[PDB]
Symmetry: C2
Subunit: 230 residues, 2 copies
Amino acid sequence: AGKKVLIVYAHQEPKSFNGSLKNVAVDELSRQGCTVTVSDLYAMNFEPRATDKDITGTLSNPEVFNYGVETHEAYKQRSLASDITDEQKKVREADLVIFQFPLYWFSVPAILKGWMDRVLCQGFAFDIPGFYDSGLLQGKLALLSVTTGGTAEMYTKTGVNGDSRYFLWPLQHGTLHFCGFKVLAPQISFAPEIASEEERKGMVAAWSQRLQTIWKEEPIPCTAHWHFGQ
Amino acid sequence: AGKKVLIVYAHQEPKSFNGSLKNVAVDELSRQGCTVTVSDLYAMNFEPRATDKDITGTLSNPEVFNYGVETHEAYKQRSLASDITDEQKKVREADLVIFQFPLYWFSVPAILKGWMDRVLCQGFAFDIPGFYDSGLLQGKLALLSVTTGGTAEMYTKTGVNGDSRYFLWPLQHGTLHFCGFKVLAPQISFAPEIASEEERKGMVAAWSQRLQTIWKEEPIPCTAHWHFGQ
Ligand SMILES: Cc1cc2nc3c(=O)[nH]c(=O)nc-3n(C[C@H](O)[C@H](O)[C@H](O)COP(=O)(O)OP(=O)(O)OC[C@H]3O[C@@H](n4cnc5c(N)ncnc54)[C@H](O)[C@@H]3O)c2cc1C
Ligand SMILES: Cc1cc2nc3c(=O)[nH]c(=O)nc-3n(C[C@H](O)[C@H](O)[C@H](O)COP(=O)(O)OP(=O)(O)OC[C@H]3O[C@@H](n4cnc5c(N)ncnc54)[C@H](O)[C@@H]3O)c2cc1C
Ligand SMILES: Cc1cc(=O)n(C)c2c3c(ccc12)OCO3
Ligand SMILES: Cc1cc(=O)n(C)c2c3c(ccc12)OCO3
Ligand SMILES: [Zn+2]
Ligand SMILES: [Zn+2]
């Protein structure tokens, strides 16, 4: 309040722990007066593939299809497919984008990778060049809220998975920061599946709690040294 | 010896630089007398979404759908969807898997991320426990062949985009090594669209030339140190 929040949510099951974290993010920010929108990608059957159907009407060059060039020209000429233009308007208006997802292979599920390949297009997200700290979406906050199968200890620098910031890098720096976002600190709920149940309700409530002061937070100093450095 | 290769390929335009790197891989390994298979994900309209459509049997927990639990059970039961089992059969038989793709947001295009999410399921590619050096696909080689928009210097330490290896981590270590593969050194073909004809032509021949000696190669030490250093 008086802010707009988009939650991009990527889980198949409403009773999941991811559902719960999305449902408290809605409740708590609703409570505070914020304007809230949720893109439930599985329930929308969101199309993850970057293809020629993403451009309506006719293309610059049907001899050799280049996806980046074509989507860029289609953004400028307002001829993107409507699923994409709908998401862009939500992002455009949002002051905070929250991504709520289970970690798949040290990254986002494919349905959410496709939202990012398709919606964050050239002309809207960034414009080769006019990027990083000057990316087209500067002023907006972005926040990853990730659940993991693996425990907190596995995600340290000398444990099996290496350090959490290592996988964060393509998402946080290569995507969010590249587009102009200022990135709040990931929220990582480590290993909900191996409960309890008690410790679940508490991970959830720390999420609720943190969202009480979300607007006070400072953005991470988005650098190579934050993700890897000493 | 006789060898089987799978090329998992993710570009939309047969005439692209990616198309050409894939075709010369086919020509060169074909010429050596290797068995070669290409999964052309876009021409297959490959399904990247991990949904409950991926299980044809009675669900293990039909009240609360968890994708990892259900695909693991579906795999032991032989109740996965046929597109997934067709890919697993190609991977199972392959001695080498080459991924051929344009970098999208510091990672794979979503259609390829969906191949990772849905094909590399628990019970086939890995087990809890039975991961990293004990992953189920032990024995097999894997190689990333990645094209970029950025140079060829932007991809160093400082370094607009940071070191190239930073973004390889989730793919190489978190996915491939985790499934037991030994990973060979990425083929990164920087900035083809900027590049002039002599540089394109020669990037294409440098790949051809490298494949001549591919079974002579040793895998990378797939570590935090290789990826990040210092
Ligand atoms: C393809 C694939 C790739 C993967 N790659 C990785 C990886 O790279 N790294 C990694 O660490 N893990 C990985 N995983 C594992 C995955 O990240 C975890 O399975 C997932 O994050 C668990 O979250 P969930 O929301 O789906 O759990 P859920 O099982 O849906 O939730 C956990 C439990 O909490 C319960 N619950 C729901 N809401 C509440 C609430 N309100 N209060 C109390 N309890 C509640 C649920 O009913 C359930 O019992 C991968 C999994 C898959 C399927
Ligand atoms: C959603 C999205 C996200 C992206 N994210 C990133 C990112 O994170 N980092 C980054 O660096 N880049 C990124 N890019 C840029 C992208 O990776 C490049 O556009 C891509 O790697 C170029 O490969 P291509 O095959 O499409 O090149 P093409 O445009 O197809 O190749 C350029 C030229 O090569 C020619 N060619 C093909 N074969 C040959 C041949 N054998 N001999 C001579 N010429 C040939 C073609 O005719 C063409 O004219 C992103 C792009 C998109 C669309
Ligand atoms: C890469 C990875 C690391 C990890 O710590 N865990 C628990 C994983 C997992 C998967 C797939 C990948 C991983 O499915 C269920 O649990
Ligand atoms: C993250 C990134 C780094 C980069 O160096 N380049 C060229 C990019 C690009 C994209 C999207 C992201 C990137 O579309 C066209 O070129
Ligand atoms: Zn950054
Ligand atoms: Zn590794």
